[PDB]
């Protein structure tokens, strides 16, 4: 229902598999036990066993490891009051703000390819807006637009 809300969820799900720190169906206990051995601020995205919850984000705070659910309402993503069109736009927002609730993502493969590390640097210095002002050919310009985030 709702119209273009279908086109958004189907697009993020592809990006959820593109990124490394999405663990799919994962138990809350193993998510907290995995992050308890990780440094402070390391977050993770996983599926939620609840019926009214699509995804959950588990982060290790200074006091304890918490798991926060992600609400999707009328094409906008929010954490359990700031709405976002993309799920990774929400992730990038809480990663850049001084609060530093999220710092690093615990990926299934901790060591990323050189292409991803370069892509993250290209977007950090130019931005997703200037992606078309870049002296790069289509094959590389499309790769930058495939996952345009500083994450």
């Amino acid at each position: 229902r709702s119209h273009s809300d279908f086109t958004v969820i189907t697009k993020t799900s592809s990006m959820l598999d593109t990124c490394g720190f999405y663990w799919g169906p994962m138990d809350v206990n193993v998510a907290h036990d995995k992050l308890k051995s990780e440094p402070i601020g390391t977050f993770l995205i996983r599926d939620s066993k609840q019926k009214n919850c699509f995804f959950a984000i588990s982060v290790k705070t200074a006091r304890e490891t918490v798991s926060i659910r992600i609400k999707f309402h009328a094409g906008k993503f929010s954490l359990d009051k700031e709405l976002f069109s993309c799920l990774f736009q929400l992730v990038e927002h809480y990663m850049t703000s001084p609060k530093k609730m999220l710092v690093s993502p615990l990926r299934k493969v901790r060591l990323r390819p050189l292409q991803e590390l370069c892509r993250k640097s290209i977007l950090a210095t130019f931005g997703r807006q200037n992606l078309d002002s870049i002296p790069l050919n289509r094959v590389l310009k499309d790769y930058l637009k495939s996952f345009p985030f500083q994450i």
């Binding site: 809350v28 959950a56 918490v66 798991s67 926060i68 659910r69 954490l79 359990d80």
Partner: peptide, 5 residues
């Protein structure tokens, strides 16, 4: 055990 903020 879930929370917010």
């Amino acid at each position: 055990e879930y929370s917010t903020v």
